[PDB]
Design a protein around this ligand. Sequence first.
Ligand SMILES: COc1ccc([C@@]2(c3cccc(-c4cccnc4F)c3)COC(N)=N2)cc1
Length: 372
Amino acid sequence: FVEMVDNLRGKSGQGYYVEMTVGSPPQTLNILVDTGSSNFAVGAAPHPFLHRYYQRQLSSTYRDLRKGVYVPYTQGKWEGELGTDLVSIPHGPNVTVRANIAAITESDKFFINGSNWEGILGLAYAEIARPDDSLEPFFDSLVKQTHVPNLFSLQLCGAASVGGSMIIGGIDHSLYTGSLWYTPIRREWYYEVIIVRVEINGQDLKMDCKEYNYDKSIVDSGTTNLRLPKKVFEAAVKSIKAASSTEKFPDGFWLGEQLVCWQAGTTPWNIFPVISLYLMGEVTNQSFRITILPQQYLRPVEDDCYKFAISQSSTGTVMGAVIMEGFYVVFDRARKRIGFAVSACHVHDEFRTAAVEGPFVTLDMEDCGYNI
Ligand SMILES: COc1ccc([C@@]2(c3cccc(-c4cccnc4F)c3)COC(N)=N2)cc1
């Protein structure tokens, strides 16, 4: 899959995007890769932040579905017009599919002033598609219309320009070391998983594990932070504070309300703890653990200073870029599971590495999931 290596680009905090073509003749667009949503949705009007946009009038293969879509959300809204067209991925498999496209005609706080992308590829499942699960997601269409195996993997590398790989239809073993460890996709809507235990420097937080997944835990390439439920965040910060007593920091830093700075190349990673999440394993009573360094949760702010990239949530646990940048992540849809291996590109130092380890014995893992 050499042709797909390094097919992702981005800027810090603005997401990872892949090049796509839409319409006939092909219109090239940069499209954000989002495992936390399920619509393929592209700018279709000359919004001043956009480098380019889908011009339906120029596409012979375009088909109007004569339906609108309106999507408010936590941090903004978009609206648009549903249709289909021929879609390809130049640095992907050599195929062209007929996919649903939401042509975005109005938005608020959706596009980023300064970014180099113009749409979103929602890679999650039909159930959370807008307006409803009848709007077939892109990857479902890809699998139905081609022999592309039903899986994709992501290597998000970080550093200010970032890069990575989306391997569509498979796995490239040079992008990770050690073994892949798999967690079950609990339900096919978001990529929901179950976290069964949490450690800060080997120290168990000792919370009821249902709190780790209240009301949801997901793997989301479209979220920057590691986001934790309010209660879990509270306990986690308290233990991180304790473990890092050597220096002191204002309450605003932990809350993501201000930054903290050092001199160039003198940053003291060693006084910050590793964070370990144990995930439900493939077998009854078996778990495994993924561990990240402060290089994953203390993120450079250029516009050496750093922001604390763990934050509180009311939507559940969100394993965003902070987690994903430590690992090669395999979205093995064919087998309803997600694999984690140590990433060949993750940022580390001479003392500590991001790690994926197992097996461990963990009882009552099913009880850690939230039910309505
Ligand atoms: C279908 O409607 C939506 C609404 C919001 C999204 C976002 C989204 C929309 C726009 C931008 C971004 C974004 C911003 C910064 C960095 N990375 C991103 F993915 C994220 C929000 O959460 C996730 N996972 N995707 C996707 C689809």
